């Protein structure tokens, strides 16, 4: 039993809710919140910009130190950093950004990072400003992630769609 509330169950291990991940996160304090990061951990907009804003820019300060030490992530890769006031940990995962021409096959590799964590609150990778089809993204998520994932979808219209077209 865990503290996540109001989700619809898609599979044994995938759940989904119309929610703001920032507000979903501040209430649950999940062990892991996933950020839809870029390779530079520059959290300017989308989920990343919102999450970072909710940390009063502490996420960005920590991220800049990480990059200064380690260099950029790989597309499809991830790193674990602090969750600040939102979660114990933040798993920064780089999905491919279609608006940069990145290969969509890397979306499966991106979701594989979720399997290193027993339970996660997460957005749909490569959705939103990253330009992928959130329905394809949901399919890859369901077919790749084996751990327990709670998907927060900000847009009510999108959500209702994803549900109605799910197989």
47 binds ligand QIR (CB under 6 A): yes
The interface region with ligand QIR, picked from 26-34, 57-65, 102-110, 152-160 by CB under 6 A, is: 152-160
For 108, counting Cβ atoms within 10 Å of its Cβ (0-12 exposed, 13-18 middle, 19+ buried), the class is middle
List all residues 6 or more positions away from 63 whose beta carbon is below 8 Å from its beta carbon: 41, 42, 43, 81, 92
154 binds ligand QIR (CB under 6 A): yes
36 binds ligand QIR (CB under 6 A): yes
Which residue reads 């503290």 in tokens? 3
122 binds ligand QIR (CB under 6 A): no
We find the least distance from the C-beta atom of residue 161 to ligand QIR, in angstroms, to be 12
Please count the residues of this chain forming the interface with ligand QIR, following the rule CB under 6 A.
15
Query: How open is the CA angle 27-33-38, to the nearest 5 degrees?
Result: 135
152 binds ligand QIR (CB under 6 A): yes
Which residue reads 């995962």 in tokens? 93
Structure tokens at 166: 């799910």
54 binds ligand QIR (CB under 6 A): no
We find the least distance from the C-beta atom of residue 69 to ligand QIR, in angstroms, to be 26
30 binds ligand QIR (CB under 6 A): no
7 binds ligand QIR (CB under 6 A): no
The answer for 59, left when phi > 0, alpha when psi is -120 to 50, beta otherwise, is alpha
- Quote the CA–CA distance of 56 and 160 in Å, as a whole number: 31
Enumerate binding residues for ligand QIR (CB under 6 A): 20-22, 36, 46-47, 50, 123, 127-130, 152-154
């Amino acid at each position: 039993v865990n503290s996540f509330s109001g989700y619809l169950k898609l599979t044994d291990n995938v759940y989904i809710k119309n929610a703001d991940i920032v507000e979903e996160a501040k209430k649950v304090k999940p062990t892991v919140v996933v950020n839809a990061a870029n390779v530079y951990l520059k959290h300017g907009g989308g989920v990343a910009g919102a999450l970072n804003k909710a940390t009063n820019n502490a996420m960005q300060v920590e991220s800049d130190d990480y990059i200064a030490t380690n260099g950029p992530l790989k597309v499809g890769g991830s790193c674990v950093l602090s969750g600040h006031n939102l979660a114990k940990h933040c798993l920064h995962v780089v999905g491919p950004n279609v608006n940069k021409g990145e290969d969509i096959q890397l979306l499966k590799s991106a979701y594989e990072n979720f399997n290193q964590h027993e339970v996660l609150l997460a957005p749909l990778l490569s959705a939103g400003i990253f330009g992928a089809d959130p329905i394809h993204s949901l399919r890859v998520c369901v077919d790749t992630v084996r751990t327990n994932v709670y998907l927060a979808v900000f847009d009510k219209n999108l959500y209702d769609k994803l549900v109605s077209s799910f197989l």
